[PDB]
Ligand binder design. Structure first.
Ligand SMILES: CCCCCCCCCCCCCCCC(=O)O
Ligand SMILES: CCCCCCCCCCCCCCCC(=O)O
Ligand SMILES: CCCCCCCCCCCCCCCC(=O)O
Lengths: 238, 57, 255, 268, 268, 60, 268, 60, 57, 57, 125
């Protein structure tokens, strides 16, 4: 006979709720657990794995294995551009299908550093130098090497070690950024420029390729879970 | 027999929880298990590779 | 002292030596181990040779051309017709084992290219036609390397597997295959790739014939190139060694 | 808790963190400090939202079906299986092996069908939901002895109050809910192929206890799945290609990603 | 907790566990270890689901009856007895002597009957359920003084909210609910024969408190039995032959089991 | 006057539920228990008894 | 607690509290005691009502929209933004920087639309409210897969019981909800100007789960905002001029204050 | 099975009420607070600031 | 006067129960009584018969 | 784990509060924080100016 | 352990990696240091960013042909039109700084040649 009083919000079906519920099958002997390798306890353990980036997504190249290759050849000049893309992991077409991008497209906010691992896939005698650059916003994109040199740049020398890491830091005004496009939280621009040249000996190919992997740093975070705009169904599959 | 635990609040307050059903599969979802171990997927190699070292000497 | 590029591996009565190899990748951090007594479900006594069953079997070699899309292998099926591992998994009902994968592709200093070696666990593959499912003669090839395809397979009714390479047959971005234990063999530096996969399955023991857990996949991301004057026939070899293999349920030969 | 960066000052040493070897299969963990001078910024951010439990613990509608008070279809039958809704199926496909308890909520909504019968007096409809495990009897008809439910679990619900809800433990003969099964049913290797081999979870029926009125009334029931105490093993790459069938992973090949103008364009 | 097997090794001894004597009436308990080598497998399985309490503690519908707001039948009468529903009766027949408390839930559902009366204004129907023990008065009519229930237990229920539910103790002059009685009522040995001798549990009536509207309304009530704190004695073999009458165990002879092709066929 | 809030799953009739309920007959003197041989406490005590198998189920 | 005055007696000293210098920008705090003799009156009054939390913690209706069971508009779409209701917007504009949690209550009221369809049988309408964060999918149609809400939060409500209510934390990429933003989106200084730059809070949709009857029914939903644990920074002068648009602070110039007869009139 | 009894005033929507409510977004990491000058804690801190008075409000 | 007991959970957490009705026939169903004694139905013979022995010497 | 606090009553009695939800953003509105500091808006000058003194000597 | 041919240099927000480099030559044995108080002559307070001013500026590249005689650069003039170092040395009267010089010319195993990189102080011509 305890007198109570119901408050606004009773007898409702909230989606993201956490209450208790009577079980339909009482006294069920659950099958015991076993040790299965590779247990995941947090989704940021998947975001910290390198994911191949399709930088060359131009026209038909997306329908073959040529989307993941970045062309680099022996040029007659110096200071030209190899590639460039905006820092939009959850929006740009370059980072949309990467593991990092697939994870980010479920959460509205994101923050932390980024790690771009470049691997040179040329011959054993071909040598070269490249200038990777990250330029925060404020101006447009850099158009010449004298303009991207002033950003955050790391010269890379092709040698025995065939892997170089570009750590795009966290330079922003807000603690978090949106995965969707918004000019208020613009990211920046990542551009790679020929440093000197790509020189090869005789009887060796002068056109090589470079691959790129994207991964998150130890300080990545995500927030505000939302539905992904990639998967859709016209009717219940059957 | 109540269980008192801490609430998830901002940075820079205790809440109470009591189990009523005797099936152990009716408890509320355990949301606070912030434990990780990224050593299985990243850096899974057999021989340890220090950061600032020629990976292939 | 010594360098890290040199490695030697001994198993049973077989040995593998490499002089330009990268660091071995050990599964998800677990070295394959026998089934403990607090996890078993079969009350019968198991049989464990550990010498004839565990050794480096060398499979057939495939040629790497300039227009090769890739190859896939099923670890239980490939060794089913080779030695006592084949005879045992054939005379028993339940089997359990981990695998060591070694891929050998050597080229001179004037070649270029890059391969991805990935061990995908539970690789269900979509059929070319939505209504039908792939047949047993098209999905797994005993001691044979099933090649992929550069263009999409026809949607006409058939039991052919979807062998398009930029989707890996399982309907995923070939780029995100990295999540699994993987190695890169770039002809610029690496000449071999070693992987150690433990026993990954949702049950203590399973029948090998009606369930193929791991599917080795080799994908040439960067194609092979050379100038006239170099050898054009560059093969690829794959050696598989079982580890900690045991069986249960002795039954009359079944094939 | 998110880690914090450490302050660093100009260096000139032979050892180089940036240069590594990606052929080894190892992710080079490089703090921003290695490639540029950084200041000591404490991070108070948390990874609380990401945890597998918080990612998968949200109610999602698997399937919805319809039944009529008077007419050819008086009862509804549904084989309890996932992979009928893309939003949840895609989320579950992220991990090869999953193990979770479940919470089920049934949103039952009735509506009047257009007719010519006059003098209608609507009465509170009552809905009975029954679960038949694999092997039990099947109600070949809306009125049948099977609906006694002497052992099967069932729920009765009158229209007008809070929706029904129940909790279900981990029902599997194995040690985990397998999401992918590369094998056949027969050891002959000919027969059902794929994940449909491991789908024997039963069937769920629903009916109207009492005929509401003279005029025809159609009711639709929606089923919601809420994973609890979830454990995940062996992470997998995300789908990418839209689903086609609910019994397998058959698909139509699709481009890696959306295209752009050139290799130096900063805009989609 | 389920027992666990013990590891064993090859033996060569005169004593033989497998060979025994089944004429003694003793079940030879042989561990798999006796007839073959076995390894030490711990069993974490439990026999929790099997317990008699968990087997019989599930709500089951014994009987359902109908009554009309205006018409020849305005009240319903039911002698409270089991053996009217096969699903529960079969479960109870497993043990010769049973002793349990009971929980009763009444699912009352109304519906409109087709008529020609116009200007219908439906009003909340109220249902009264009354239990008359053996010996009390009987409501010969829907409106009668008996419905005052000065001593009998009763429940009033308005349509629209949760169903009624009550708990009943162990009502028996003996020490257990006998399920089988091989005897007569008269010591003369002529008269009622069988279990119907020990069925004097009373009667249950139900009626509409208020006439709902002008148009005829039919209501059906279903009764659910939930055994609690159950004790069982003298286990018995399962029925096999379908039931025919609710006052005895009269049956039609049926084959032991379904047949097959031959004595060496592996398929039904 | 304790403010509460009903959750989804209220005012339902779940079959395999276990709650408390007011008794219709209060203060009832239950007939005492007696020792009856052969008390069953678990159904696996019946499964461990030998049962004749009809192996020759052929035709008639 | 309010301060209390102190008793004072006639004084004749050079130092003068009343005379000060208002050019310094300092408020001269003068107790009544300085300019006249006062007695010791204790003040038991409290400033409890004034506190920012008690001033802003009252439910206020931001926006209301309408949807129809059958017709051209079957679902409602609203970009979640303040500044649509003058009463709350004016209260919030008092402080340049605000930081508060929120409580949302949805008052959903249905009504029948006039029509000619006969034989209407009204059924309990069910209303689903869905929140899409910035970036998610949009239900281009009332019936669409988006309404599965595998990740988005949603609430289902049947008509007849207490209104829905939920609590929302502080959702902002910054450290406070900015109320005024004197800048543009583009660093070019050309583009969206004003506070509409920092409004990316998502969208809120609502629909009817089940068609209620044959006759058309229109439902209107009202949204209420309740600030909790509020913190305010940088106080600002009150509006004065009526609002015109909900995307900026554009206004029409208005007189300082209402006028009177002369400079010595004591009446308005 | 605790027997209760609802009192007058249940299932109402009072404007100036103070109860608890389930959050729509569980386990949200709130952005930390920072020191911003000029924090207001009571409206009588604004009333104690000098305000120019329009005494000559005559006509135009 | 509350009673705290253990929940039935998997292998390889306390719940609370309070009685409100004073009839002792209204308590919840006692589901945890995992006790057995198969000696009455199986092996019910008068003279003990060891497993590995000639049942009829 | 209950919290007992004082009620706001007239001048010139304890109430009980328990937190049930584990998000820390669902607690009731904290209404009793009667703290002030008018030194920021009134008298904000750098050099202290005593009341009874020539503000500009 | 490691080899001496690999070197990494970080300054400000710029990094330089080399995999076939010789030993760094450090002037006349003195590492560049700020002006001490027992040596100054200007009584005004100095300004020291040390981040924008100190960083690796990359100049224009020149081609090495078979008939190239050589090239010369002036360190104060070359950086006068590049970044805040140019802006600061332009808005001030007195300046002081040391310099780190890196020259990059890569060729395969089948090329041959040799360059001399020399920092001449006070090179009147
Ligand atoms: C009134 C009915 C109550 C009981 C209903 C039970 C229906 C669900 C049964 C368990 C299903 C668990 C999920 C299996 C599918 C999967 O794991 O992918
Ligand atoms: C409003 C009515 C409440 C009381 C209703 C009591 C009806 C049931 C009486 C006890 C019956 C117990 C079972 C007897 C039959 C049996 O044991 O086989
Ligand atoms: C069923 C939907 C539940 C969730 C609905 C959330 C809608 C409100 C989102 C937060 C808005 C907070 C206020 C932003 C505007 C402002 O600060 O001026």
């Amino acid at each position: 006979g305890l007198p109570t009083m119901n408050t606004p919000g009773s007898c409702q079906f909230l989606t993201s709720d956490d209450f208790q519920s009577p079980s339909a099958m009482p006294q069920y002997d659950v099958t015991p657990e076993m040790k299965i390798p590779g247990e995941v306890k947090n989704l940021m353990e998947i975001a910290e794995v390198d994911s191949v980036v399709p930088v060359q997504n131009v026209g038909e190249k997306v329908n073959s294995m040529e989307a993941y290759q970045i062309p680099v050849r022996s040029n007659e000049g110096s200071g030209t551009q190899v590639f460039g893309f905006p820092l939009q992991p959850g929006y740009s077409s370059v980072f949309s299908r990467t593991l990092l991008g697939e994870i980010l497209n479920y959460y509205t906010h994101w923050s932390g550093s980024i790690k771009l691992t470049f691997m040179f896939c040329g011959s054993a005698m071909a040598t070269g130098k490249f200038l990777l650059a990250y330029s925060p916003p404020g101006a447009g994109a850099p158009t010449k090497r004298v303009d991207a040199m002033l950003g955050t740049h790391v010269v890379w020398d092709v040698g025995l070690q065939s892997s170089c890491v570009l750590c795009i830091p966290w330079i922003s005004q807000t603690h978090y950024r949106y995965v969707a496009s918004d000019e208020y939280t613009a990211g920046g621009f990542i551009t790679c420029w020929y440093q000197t040249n790509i020189v090869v000996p005789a009887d060796a190919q002068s056109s090589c390729y470079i691959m790129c992997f994207v991964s998150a740093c130890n300080d990545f975070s995500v927030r505000l879970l939302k539905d992904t705009p990639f998967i859709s169904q016209n009717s219940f599959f059957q | 027999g109540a269980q008192v635990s801490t609430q998830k609040t901002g940075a820079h307050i205790h809440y109470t929880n009591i189990n009523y059903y005797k099936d152990a599969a009716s408890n509320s979802a355990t949301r606070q298990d912030f434990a990780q171990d990224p050593g299985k997927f990243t850096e899974p190699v057999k021989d340890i590779m220090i950061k600032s070292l020629p990976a292939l000497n | 002292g010594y360098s890290d590029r040199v490695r030697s591996i001994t198993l049973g009565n077989s040995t593998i030596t490499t002089q330009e190899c990268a660091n071995v990748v050990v599964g998800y951090g677990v070295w394959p181990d026998y089934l403990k007594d607090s996890e078993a479900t079969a009350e019968d006594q198991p049989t464990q040779p550990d010498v004839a069953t565990c050794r480096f079997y060398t499979l057939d070699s495939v040629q790497w051309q300039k227009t090769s899309p890739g190859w896939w292998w099923k670890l239980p099926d490939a060794l089913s017709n080779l030695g006592l591992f084949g005879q045992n998994m054939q005379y028993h009902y339940l089997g359990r084992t981990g695998y060591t994968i070694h891929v050998q592709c050597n080229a001179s200093k004037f070649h270029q290219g890059c391969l991805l070696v990935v061990c995908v666990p539970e690789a269900e593959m979509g059929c070319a036609t939505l209504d039908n499912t792939p047949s047993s003669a098209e999905l797994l090839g005993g001691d044979a390397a099933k090649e992929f395809a550069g263009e999409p397979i026809a949607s006409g009714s058939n039991k052919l597997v979807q062998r398009v390479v930029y989707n890996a047959g399982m309907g995923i971005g070939v780029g995100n295959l990295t999540i699994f234990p993987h190695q890169w063999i770039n002809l610029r530096t690496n000449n071999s790739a070693t992987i150690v996969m433990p026993y990954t399955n949702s049950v203590p023991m399973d029948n090998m014939f009606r369930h193929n857990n791991i599917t080795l996949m080799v994908i040439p991301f960067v194609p092979l190139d050379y100038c006239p004057g170099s050898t054009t026939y560059v093969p690829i070899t794959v050696t598989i060694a079982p580890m900690c293999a045991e069986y249960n349920g002795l039954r009359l030969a079944s094939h | 808790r998110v880690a914090d960066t450490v302050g660093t000052g100009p260096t000139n040493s032979e050892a180089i963190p940036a240069l590594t070897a990606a052929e080894t299969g190892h992710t080079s963990q490089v703090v921003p400090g290695d490639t540029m001078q950084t200041r000591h910024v404490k991070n108070y951010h948390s990874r609380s939202e990401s945890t597998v439990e918080n990612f998968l613990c949200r109610s999602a509608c698997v399937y919805f079906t319809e039944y009529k008070n008077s007419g050819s279809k008086r009862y509804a039958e549904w084989v309890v299986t996932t992979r009928q809704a893309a939003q949840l199926r895609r989320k579950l496909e992220f991990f090869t092996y999953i193990r979770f308890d479940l919470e089920l909520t049934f949103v039952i909504t009735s509506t009047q069908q257009p007719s010519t019968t006059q003098n209608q007096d609507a009465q509170i409809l009552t809905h009975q939901i029954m679960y038949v495990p694999p092997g039990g009897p099947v109600p070949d008809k809306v009125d049948s002895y099977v609906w006694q439910t002497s052992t099967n679990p069932s729920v009765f619900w009158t229209e007008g109050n809070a929706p029904p809800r129940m909790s279900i433990p981990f029902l599997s003969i194995g040690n985990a809910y397998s999401n992918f099964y590369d094998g056949w049913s027969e050891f002959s290797r000919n027969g059902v192929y794929g994940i449909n081999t491991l789908n024997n979870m039963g069937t769920l029926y629903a009916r109207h206890v009492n005929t509401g009125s003279t005029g025809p009334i159609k009711s639709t029931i929606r089923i919601y799945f809420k994973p609890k105490h979830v454990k995940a093993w062996i992470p997998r790459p995300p789908r990418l290609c839209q689903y086609e069938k609910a019994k397998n992973v058959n698909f139509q090949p699709s481009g890696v990603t959306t295209t752009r103008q050139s290799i130096t364009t900063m805009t989609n």
